[PDB]
Design an enzyme around this catalytic site. Structure first.
Site, PDB file in Angstrom:
ATOM      1  N   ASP A 132      -7.639 -54.954 -24.755  1.00 36.33           N
ATOM      2  CA  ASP A 132      -9.050 -55.812 -25.019  1.00 36.33           C
ATOM      3  C   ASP A 132     -10.065 -55.365 -24.026  1.00 36.33           C
ATOM      4  OD1 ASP A 132      -9.935 -57.731 -26.439  1.00 36.33           O
ATOM      5  OD2 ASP A 132      -9.627 -59.453 -25.383  1.00 36.33           O
ATOM      6  N   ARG A 136     -17.614 -58.182 -22.814  1.00 36.15           N
ATOM      7  CA  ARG A 136     -17.653 -59.603 -22.692  1.00 36.15           C
ATOM      8  C   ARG A 136     -16.283 -59.656 -21.668  1.00 36.15           C
ATOM      9  NH1 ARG A 136     -15.655 -58.017 -27.463  1.00 36.15           N
ATOM     10  NH2 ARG A 136     -13.474 -58.007 -27.768  1.00 36.15           N
ATOM     11  N   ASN A 137     -15.249 -58.841 -21.533  1.00 36.36           N
ATOM     12  CA  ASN A 137     -14.212 -59.306 -20.552  1.00 36.36           C
ATOM     13  C   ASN A 137     -14.604 -58.709 -19.156  1.00 36.36           C
ATOM     14  OD1 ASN A 137     -12.748 -60.499 -22.483  1.00 36.36           O
ATOM     15  ND2 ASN A 137     -11.975 -58.852 -23.447  1.00 36.36           N
ATOM     16  N   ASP A 150      -9.889 -60.925 -18.011  1.00 36.68           N
ATOM     17  CA  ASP A 150      -9.012 -61.158 -19.258  1.00 36.68           C
ATOM     18  C   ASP A 150      -7.500 -60.370 -19.458  1.00 36.68           C
ATOM     19  OD1 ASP A 150      -8.863 -62.193 -22.042  1.00 36.68           O
ATOM     20  OD2 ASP A 150      -9.054 -59.964 -22.609  1.00 36.68           O
TER      21      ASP A 150
HETATM   22  C1  LIG Z   1     -20.150 -68.061 -18.656  1.00 36.50           C
HETATM   23  O1  LIG Z   1     -21.250 -67.944 -17.940  1.00 36.50           O
HETATM   24  C2  LIG Z   1     -21.518 -67.518 -16.703  1.00 36.50           C
HETATM   25  C3  LIG Z   1     -20.051 -67.595 -15.855  1.00 36.50           C
HETATM   26  C4  LIG Z   1     -20.096 -66.982 -14.694  1.00 36.50           C
HETATM   27  N1  LIG Z   1     -19.150 -67.017 -13.975  1.00 36.50           N
HETATM   28  C5  LIG Z   1     -17.847 -66.947 -14.073  1.00 36.50           C
HETATM   29  N2  LIG Z   1     -17.196 -66.249 -13.085  1.00 36.50           N
HETATM   30  C6  LIG Z   1     -15.783 -66.349 -13.258  1.00 36.50           C
HETATM   31  C7  LIG Z   1     -15.034 -66.752 -14.585  1.00 36.50           C
HETATM   32  C8  LIG Z   1     -16.133 -67.291 -15.709  1.00 36.50           C
HETATM   33  N3  LIG Z   1     -17.318 -67.195 -15.286  1.00 36.50           N
HETATM   34  C9  LIG Z   1     -15.888 -67.667 -16.800  1.00 36.50           C
HETATM   35  C10 LIG Z   1     -16.493 -68.535 -17.215  1.00 36.50           C
HETATM   36  C11 LIG Z   1     -16.215 -69.236 -18.586  1.00 36.50           C
HETATM   37  C12 LIG Z   1     -15.329 -68.823 -19.170  1.00 36.50           C
HETATM   38 CL1  LIG Z   1     -14.790 -69.361 -20.578  1.00 36.50          CL
HETATM   39  C13 LIG Z   1     -14.277 -67.660 -18.697  1.00 36.50           C
HETATM   40  C14 LIG Z   1     -14.662 -67.269 -17.471  1.00 36.50           C
HETATM   41  C15 LIG Z   1     -13.921 -65.969 -16.946  1.00 36.50           C
HETATM   42  C16 LIG Z   1     -13.262 -65.104 -18.124  1.00 36.50           C
HETATM   43  C17 LIG Z   1     -14.231 -64.494 -18.715  1.00 36.50           C
HETATM   44  F1  LIG Z   1     -15.807 -64.555 -18.676  1.00 36.50           F
HETATM   45  C18 LIG Z   1     -14.007 -63.319 -19.681  1.00 36.50           C
HETATM   46  C19 LIG Z   1     -12.303 -63.246 -19.968  1.00 36.50           C
HETATM   47  C20 LIG Z   1     -11.450 -64.139 -19.258  1.00 36.50           C
HETATM   48  C21 LIG Z   1     -11.997 -65.073 -18.476  1.00 36.50           C
HETATM   49  O2  LIG Z   1     -11.076 -65.768 -17.653  1.00 36.50           O
HETATM   50  C22 LIG Z   1     -10.029 -65.155 -17.110  1.00 36.50           C
HETATM   51  N4  LIG Z   1     -13.429 -65.806 -15.923  1.00 36.50           N
HETATM   52  C23 LIG Z   1     -13.741 -66.482 -14.570  1.00 36.50           C
HETATM   53  C24 LIG Z   1     -21.396 -66.983 -14.092  1.00 36.50           C
HETATM   54  C25 LIG Z   1     -22.704 -67.172 -14.736  1.00 36.50           C
HETATM   55  C26 LIG Z   1     -22.703 -67.421 -16.122  1.00 36.50           C
HETATM   56  C27 LIG Z   1     -23.645 -67.668 -16.787  1.00 36.50           C
HETATM   57  O3  LIG Z   1     -24.013 -67.276 -18.082  1.00 36.50           O
HETATM   58  O4  LIG Z   1     -24.798 -67.898 -16.335  1.00 36.50           O
END
Ligand SMILES: COc1cc(Nc2ncc3c(n2)-c2ccc(Cl)cc2C(c2c(F)cccc2OC)=NC3)ccc1C(=O)O
Length: 263
Positions: A132, A136-137, A150
């Protein structure tokens, strides 16, 4: 093992998204306090959902690499259950680059691709097939380090032998990496724009490949094309991609375009 964290050592500070299993937060973790991302398991979960949710942290806990998202720990003994990871200040790579359209040097973009390739090389050398891989990941921190996340069906990122015959290998991850290179060099354009999934599959079989991004170095686009070879054994390995990108970074004139020699 997985470090088990006591909920009193976590502060949830801001909601940053909706995950498959519940709300995701930015917060802090006491260990000096460190900023973290916090995934929660929503109340009212199936046993399968609880197992799936905690399986992500099981996979992620097996890995330790500068370009793979760090698992800080889990809360499994209290509710809600939580997966605590390093916080990535700049968020998802595709959205980050769209908001920053045209604001990076080509060397900087190739460096981001180098980190992603190095994380994927580490995964492949641990016999982990991601399946995957997509911008986006990938997450980006404040120093622009890109890390794969992811760990747990999107047609236009998947190699054709994985679509047609379910052959998922590191070689099909390499195909995905090619699409990621194109996402990066276009600053987050959507692959194949809004061609239908059927039109996408049809064009790839007929030999269509995504076109060169504006100002993309020749060696970078040809590396994409090599990642998109129909016969998977002719694709570079991630070890090769890392070695190639390091050579380009070390010969940075190879990355220049017209504006580097004019306005
Ligand atoms: C989502 O928006 C942000 C996330 C940020 N940081 C962040 N850091 C770690 C994670 C995430 N997000 C995040 C935030 C929301 C969601 Cl639904 C998931 C995650 C994830 C993540 C991912 F972005 C993609 C795939 C899997 C994930 O979790 C395992 N992983 C952990 C920082 C800035 C922004 C922004 O748009 O300004």
């Amino acid at each position: 093992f997985t470090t088990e964290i006591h909920p009193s050592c976590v502060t949830r500070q801001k909601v940053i998204g909706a995950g498959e299993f519940g709300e995701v937060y930015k917060g802090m973790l006491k260990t000096k306090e460190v900023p973290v991302a916090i995934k929660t398991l929503k109340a009212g979960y199936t046993e399968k959902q609880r197992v799936d949710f905690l399986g992500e942290a099981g996979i992620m806990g097996q890995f330790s690499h500068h370009n793979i998202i760090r698992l800080e720990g889990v809360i499994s003994k209290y509710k809600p259950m939580m997966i605590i990871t390093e916080y990535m200040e700049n968020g998802a790579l595709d959205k980050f680059l769209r908001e920053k359209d045209g604001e990076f040097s080509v060397l900087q973009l190739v460096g981001m691709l180098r980190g992603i390739a190095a994380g994927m090389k580490y995964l492949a050398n641990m016999n982990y097939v991601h399946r995957d891989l997509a911008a986006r990941n990938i997450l980006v921190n404040s120093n622009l380090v890109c890390k794969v996340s992811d760990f747990g069906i999107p047609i236009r990122w998947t190699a054709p032998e994985a679509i047609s015959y379910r052959k998922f290998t590191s070689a099909s991850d390499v195909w995905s990496f090619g699409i990621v290179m194109w996402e990066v060099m276009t600053y987050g354009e959507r692959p194949y724009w809004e061609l239908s999934n059927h039109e996408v599959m049809k064009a790839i079989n007929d030999g269509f490949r995504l076109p060169t991004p504006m100002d993309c170095p020749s060696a970078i686009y040809q590396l994409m094309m090599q990642c998109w070879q129909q016969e998977r054994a002719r694709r570079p390995k991630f070890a090769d991609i890392v070695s190639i990108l390091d050579k380009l970074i070390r010969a940075p004139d190879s990355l220049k375009t017209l504006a580097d020699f004019d306005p």
